[PDB]
């Protein structure tokens, strides 16, 4: 209704974007809108989730944070351009090392320690939120989902989802630890647990079995292995926080995040 769009008029920016913004080219196509690339910045093209979505990235800067930088009324949304495309494209095209998932985990956790020590749950942790720099910059996206603090929304994409969050119990940001646990079993694997499986019967996998079990544990090293489980414990105040994990000793084999541009030219030559 009027008194939400009247909200959200008043935080957009006024002024032609088309005067301030130019050579642009499409670059996708989703659920939410079209994203065109510009100059160099990413715009995307497309209720009361709108508002809190620019109003919690304009306040939530940070370097593992895809900057967020103006917005224009359909509703146009401009941010920081990487170039490397998704973690997506690389985990489904290539086949990481253990010093690059740590080196993707790191930069993800330092994002996570910085929005839950700011009241902040993302609820949407999966590789498709996460952007790279072509110097191998590690980025988080996609605040639509994200709450301010516990909550009780049965509230993400079913595959990366906390068993908490899928049986509806009272959550805090740990939540979000194990989504990053997920995003690490489709480094390893390719695909979060159940990709084969309906989203609803992924759903009920979860709430059933829990703690998600890899299909080769073996080939994984002792410490990988324990940050996995620290990452996705049944009981919430067992898993660790964001700052806990930064400490593992899993992320002390990370390689420079140089190492990752390697993998962004595969994935780009395997999906052209
Ligand atoms: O999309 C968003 C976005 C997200 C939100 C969150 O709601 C808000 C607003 C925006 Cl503008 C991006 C923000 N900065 C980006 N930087 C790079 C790319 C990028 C590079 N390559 N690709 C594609 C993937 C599909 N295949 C062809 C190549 C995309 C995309 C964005």
């Known amino acids: 209704?009027?008194?939400?769009?009247?909200?959200?008029?008043?935080?957009?920016?006024?002024?032609?974007?088309?005067?301030?913004?130019?050579?642009?080219?499409?670059?996708?196509?989703?659920?939410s809108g079209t994203v065109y690339?510009?100059?160099?910045?990413?715009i995307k093209q497309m209720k009361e989730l709108i508002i809190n979505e620019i109003l919690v990235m304009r306040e939530n800067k940070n370097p593992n944070i895809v900057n967020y930088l103006d917005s224009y009324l359909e509703l146009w949304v401009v941010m920081e351009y990487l170039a490397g495309g998704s973690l997506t494209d690389v985990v489904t095209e290539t086949c990481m090392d253990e010093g690059q998932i740590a080196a993707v985990c790191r930069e993800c956790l330092q994002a996570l320690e910085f929005l839950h020590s700011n009241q902040v749950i993302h609820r949407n942790i999966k590789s498709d939120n996460i952007?790279?720099?072509?110097?191998?910059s590690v980025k988080l996206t996609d605040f639509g989902f994200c709450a301010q603090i516990k909550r009780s929304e049965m509230v993400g994409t079913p595959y990366w989802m906390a068993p908490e969050v899928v049986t509806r119990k009272a959550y805090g940001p740990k939540v979000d630890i194990?989504?990053?646990?997920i995003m690490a079993i489709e480094?390893?694997?390719?695909?979060?647990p159940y990709l084969?499986?309906?989203?609803?019967?992924?759903?009920?996998?979860?709430?059933?079995?829990?703690?998600?079990?890899?299909?080769?544990?073996?080939?994984?090293?002792?410490?990988?292995?324990?940050?996995?489980?620290?990452?996705?414990?049944?009981?919430?105040?067992?898993?660790?926080?964001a700052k806990?994990?930064?400490?593992?000793?899993?992320?002390?084999?990370?390689?420079?995040?140089?190492?990752?541009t390697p993998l962004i030219a595969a994935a780009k030559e395997a999906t052209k």
């Open 1 to 31: 209704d009027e008194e939400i769009l009247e909200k959200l008029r008043s935080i957009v920016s006024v002024g032609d974007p088309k005067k301030k913004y130019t050579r642009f080219e499409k670059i996708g196509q989703g659920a």
């Open 37 to 42: 690339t510009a100059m160099e910045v990413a």
């Open 131 to 136: 952007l790279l720099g072509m110097d191998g």
């Open 178 to 181: 194990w989504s990053l646990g």
């Open 187 to 192: 480094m390893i694997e390719g695909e979060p």
């Open 196 to 241: 084969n499986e309906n989203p609803l019967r992924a759903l009920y996998l979860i709430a059933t079995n829990g703690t998600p079990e890899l299909q080769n544990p073996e080939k994984l090293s002792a410490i990988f292995r324990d940050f996995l489980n620290r990452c996705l414990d049944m009981d919430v105040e067992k898993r660790g926080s």
């Open 244 to 260: 806990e994990l930064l400490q593992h000793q899993f992320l002390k084999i990370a390689k420079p995040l140089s190492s990752l």
